[PDB]
Design a protein around this ligand. Sequence first.
Ligand SMILES: Nc1nc2c(ncn2[C@@H]2O[C@H](COP(=O)(O)OP(=O)(O)OP(=O)(O)O)[C@@H](O)[C@H]2O)c(=O)[nH]1
Ligand SMILES: Nc1nc2c(ncn2[C@@H]2O[C@H](COP(=O)(O)OP(=O)(O)O)[C@@H](O)[C@H]2O)c(=O)[nH]1
Ligand SMILES: [Ca+2]
Ligand SMILES: [Mg+2]
Lengths: 155, 431, 437
Amino acid sequence: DLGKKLLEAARAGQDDEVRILMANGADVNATDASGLTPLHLAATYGHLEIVEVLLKHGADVNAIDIMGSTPLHLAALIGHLEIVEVLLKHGADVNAVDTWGDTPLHLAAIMGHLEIVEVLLKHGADVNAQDKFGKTAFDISIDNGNEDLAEILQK
Amino acid sequence: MREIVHIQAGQCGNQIGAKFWEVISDEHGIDPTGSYHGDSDLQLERINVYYNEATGNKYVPRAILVDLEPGTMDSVRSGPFGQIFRPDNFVFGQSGAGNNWAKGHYTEGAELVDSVLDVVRKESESCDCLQGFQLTHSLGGGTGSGMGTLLISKIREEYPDRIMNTFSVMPSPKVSDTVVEPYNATLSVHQLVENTDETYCIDNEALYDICFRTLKLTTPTYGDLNHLVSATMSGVTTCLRFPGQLNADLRKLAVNMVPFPRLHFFMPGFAPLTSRGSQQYRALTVPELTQQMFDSKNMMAACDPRHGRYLTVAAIFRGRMSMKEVDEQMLNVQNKNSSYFVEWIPNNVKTAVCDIPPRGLKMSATFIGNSTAIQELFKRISEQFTAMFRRKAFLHWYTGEGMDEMEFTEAESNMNDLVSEYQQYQDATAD
Amino acid sequence: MRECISIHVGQAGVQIGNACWELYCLEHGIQPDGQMPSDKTIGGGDDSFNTFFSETGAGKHVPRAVFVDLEPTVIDEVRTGTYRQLFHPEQLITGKEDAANNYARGHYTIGKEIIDLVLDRIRKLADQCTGLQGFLVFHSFGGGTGSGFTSLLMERLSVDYGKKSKLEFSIYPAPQVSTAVVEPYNSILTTHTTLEHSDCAFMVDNEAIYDICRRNLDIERPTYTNLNRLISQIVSSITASLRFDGALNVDLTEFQTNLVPYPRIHFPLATYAPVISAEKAYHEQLSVAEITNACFEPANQMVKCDPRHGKYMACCLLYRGDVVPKDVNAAIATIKTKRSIQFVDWCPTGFKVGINYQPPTVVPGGDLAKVQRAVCMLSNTTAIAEAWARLDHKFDLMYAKRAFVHWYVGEGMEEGEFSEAREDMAALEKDYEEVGV
Ligand SMILES: Nc1nc2c(ncn2[C@@H]2O[C@H](COP(=O)(O)OP(=O)(O)OP(=O)(O)O)[C@@H](O)[C@H]2O)c(=O)[nH]1
Ligand SMILES: Nc1nc2c(ncn2[C@@H]2O[C@H](COP(=O)(O)OP(=O)(O)O)[C@@H](O)[C@H]2O)c(=O)[nH]1
Ligand SMILES: [Ca+2]
Ligand SMILES: [Mg+2]
């Protein structure tokens, strides 16, 4: 089964292995036990070239795992700015909500990735989106006293 | 209570540790070769607390230098006082821990820890009346945090009756946007609540904020941050290094500052704030020093003290000034801000005056607060930890070194219980 | 002549003891090396000053005193100071590590490592006495050694010297010069465990002494040196009757007879007058009537409280200097009538009077003017219960939250001891209430 090998190659950043596996019928949209796809894993571990490659070969840019995480959630959380822009350019839902009520904006704000916050805002991120506990991204900036983030959210 | 054994672990630990030794050596009139060049008897009265007396009237820091990364060993030697440290007291491994708390605590770091204990023993048995230990480290990395907390636990069981004290620097995405650092800091805070008596929380978030917004440094360097740290560490150890009667050793400081065993994380503050190119800073008055000292902008932890209550406070004024004036201003700030102190600990603010000021200053004031507002710092880290941990991001880096995943849940649970305990005493009344 | 041994425990007891023995030497004419030219019997004798000083064959007069501390810093100053030759060097006893402002360390852990050495050194002084009457014990309430080691010592002394009297001079804490937040704890703990082992205790309120230095002596920010010089002047007035000829309070037993009607309420109040600044060397001399009236002003008391709020059970007036007995009698009569002084119904409503016709000595370097007459009033009044109430309240505020309690349980103390000590204090407050209605 080439799907499990494609998952591993996407996580490990093996560009050539990804290309060979796809040419031999490997399921680009295969999932591991928790619903993570090769695109999820490449976005998590920062392999930009593999992200672009998968998107040109039928990867669902808005796939969700068991917890409702999209690839954009994970790229925003880990802080890969280049991958965030590639995903948005290929139709990623900027306001996707996971099972904790978080949007990519929530996660970029929490982790302090201010440049990613700006990009998400420029692409229509909803500042009124509340997580499961009622918090918007702006609420998180006030409750943490992060003045730099608070300024950005009122640009 | 005399000798203190100083340990610095990891990159941040050795960096601020070296800066500490540079700054207090200058205060005590000690040159990079170890020779006393000073002009005051006060400088030597308590020199034994931090330095050993060597062969030819030479003073050697009672310091132990540790890192899994060899490169920092050479960077220490390259420094101004790099040749004053005992060559026997460098304990350095082969390869760094790669920001992996598990490598520091369980694998690489555990291999090297017995080598460190031997050096600790050799310095300890050489002491006439050992007080305890101070350790400088970061919580965000792998060596300082992972190996540091392992070293603490080992020392604590060999010297269970001595005081364990740490200067622990908290991670901030504003200084290092490395996403596993909330993991490492949370795992370390869990160790520190159980295994240290006193911890100075030095918050990189606060250090950045001060440099950027108050000192107006557009792009702060580690040298800019560490300038604030060295000034703080000099201030909070003043009472240990010069003659005095209040908080004059590590244990008397502890019983004055720690009313509940787990609530031993201190918020330090400093006035005036300077920027390595401080021009001709004019002397501040005692009332100015006193206000600035309780000001959120002067705290080395990113918390608003007005959002909580002070359980205990120690203040140290340095320089030549009217003792009567200090009594009046300290009394006054306690009257003005009476709602920010708990009423069920009477007389919980203690004041020391020290005659010798720090370099380049005629007046300075140092603040040591045990404040329930510190929960803002732990809640910040806890939120970042939970965002990463809920998606199980990079967990295999840790479990791959043998860590159980339940260690992550137990650490998170402990930090949340710590936050609840601060909130409990913040809401208590005397009734 | 019956001997008295003085014991000085911890920093406060040692520093006050140093000030007291300096003043004693000046009053008796003893030089810093122990020589006393006006003493004709060389190598011995039965004079009144021998209650506090023994004699060697070479004419040296040596204090009957032990100094004990758990760290060496303070006692080292005695060993190298002006009176370095005066004391038995084996009666200066130091450990290495102090009690860290923790009663439990003084009483249980650190204190137990030196207690047997102290008792053996005390036995050596006791063996030189022909008729030891007992002990004067100087210590703070607030420190770990002063509180915790003192009560361990008092416990052992009751076993080894069961029939001997034990008197305390105790330093009661004040926030202006306090070194530790837990001082109310240490104060309650030592009071509870010493109460049955002490026959009479004179409390010195550091706040009262502090305010007298500010008001009467024009010292802007008093230090321990200023406080201790005034305290030693007052302690000297209290022990004068033991060291000189006289008819009042002539042995330790008489202190209890005159001042302590029931064993638990054994805390007399001391008042002293006049206190005049050395800057006023040409002050007009105050009369016997003026200094006697001053003894009933709260501002001159060693403990902050209001005796107008209480009832008297005993009152002794000890004069020093140019004092004609008839003038004391007339001054008493005016006070007995004019002022509002209420005794309990079951006590004789009289004043005991002793006069020593030598004026007080002043120490060179001191803050006090010379005076021709002075008075120290010792009274047992229910108003001193106010001092306990203030302490008990600060205790209750912290103990309700169990603040700092872990420091004590960590050093071999059971948490139940806090509750036992506090309930004994509540019973003490009721003891005063039931006498004064
Ligand atoms: N009047 C007076 N009070 C003193 C003096 N020294 C200390 N104190 C008071 O005594 C209390 C502290 O107790 P200390 O005597 O210093 O402590 P210690 O007995 O040496 O015990 P540890 O140091 O804890 O082992 C505080 O309330 C001080 O204000 C002094 O020289 N004179
Ligand atoms: N304030 C300050 N923080 C530092 C310094 N060096 C590293 N850090 C911080 O420490 C964390 C990384 O830990 P580090 O000490 O470099 O890793 P270690 O060598 O494994 O202990 C990051 O949060 C850095 O921002 C320094 O010199 N000053
Ligand atoms: Ca004789
Ligand atoms: Mg002491």
